[PDB]
Design a protein around this ligand. Sequence first.
Ligand code: WHT
Ligand code: CL
Ligand code: MG
Length: 295
Amino acid sequence: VSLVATLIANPAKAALAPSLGIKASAAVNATGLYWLADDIACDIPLPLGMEASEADASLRATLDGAPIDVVVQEQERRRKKILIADMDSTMIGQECIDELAEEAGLRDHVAAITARAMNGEIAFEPALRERVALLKGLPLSVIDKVISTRITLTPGGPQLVRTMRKHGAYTALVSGGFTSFTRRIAEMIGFNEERANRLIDDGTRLTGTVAEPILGREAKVEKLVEIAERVGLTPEDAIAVGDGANDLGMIQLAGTGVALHAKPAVAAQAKMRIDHGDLTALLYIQGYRKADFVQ
Ligand SMILES: N[C@@H](CP(=O)(O)O)C(=O)O
Ligand SMILES: [Cl-]
Ligand SMILES: [Mg+2]
């Protein structure tokens, strides 16, 4: 029944100063205080008989004004053995759909749909169909043009995935985006597997359609189920991280589910939030020390 709280800063704004650690440590009346990364993350072994509802409040209030995330959990079962991760806006900095939209002159028009889809105001599948329709007649060349010139990796991402593969964890990049993107991005970051939707083409141009049945909110949950049976585990052994409504099924089902820099209504719904850290936050959530990372 033993607890632990973890404080995480962004490694590029490492404001978790030694004095804050002690302060927070004593706000929750804690014994140990264990440093995972100097000025970035620390473990506060909670005292028994304290619902995380309180330890959250104590720590969030003590830390108020500082760019430091708080999560509380049980110390055992912290290191997950599956990672299932969103691509667009989670592991890359862009929306692959919105970037292709630039190549048709409608980035602004399509990004507003994307925004509403990822907030959960519209279902993913008609949102994909509507946005993808406007890519009709686009040549296939635009794919690598966008990957090469406008796609960039979210900080912490290679480190996160490489460091879990080092500890025997299966890592899947599970996206509502497009296989021509996820196949490259996943090899680039270091995933074992990727699964995304598929654009249809005639051999030169994009048809403007997507291969049906579309993978949406539900298909991310099933991929999580498929992977867990396949590897001899349950989804409780998984950590899931995304930003939009199509990740909520998989975030809610995983043993550890993380709304990372999530849209307004999405973070409103998630139990565990990271609003300041980068992708290394998930390593510190899992109890890794910076010693244990892959450089
Ligand atoms: N957000 C993207 C795809 P994803 O984040 O699931 O990788 C979209 O709107 O199509
Ligand atoms: Cl594709
Ligand atoms: Mg996303």
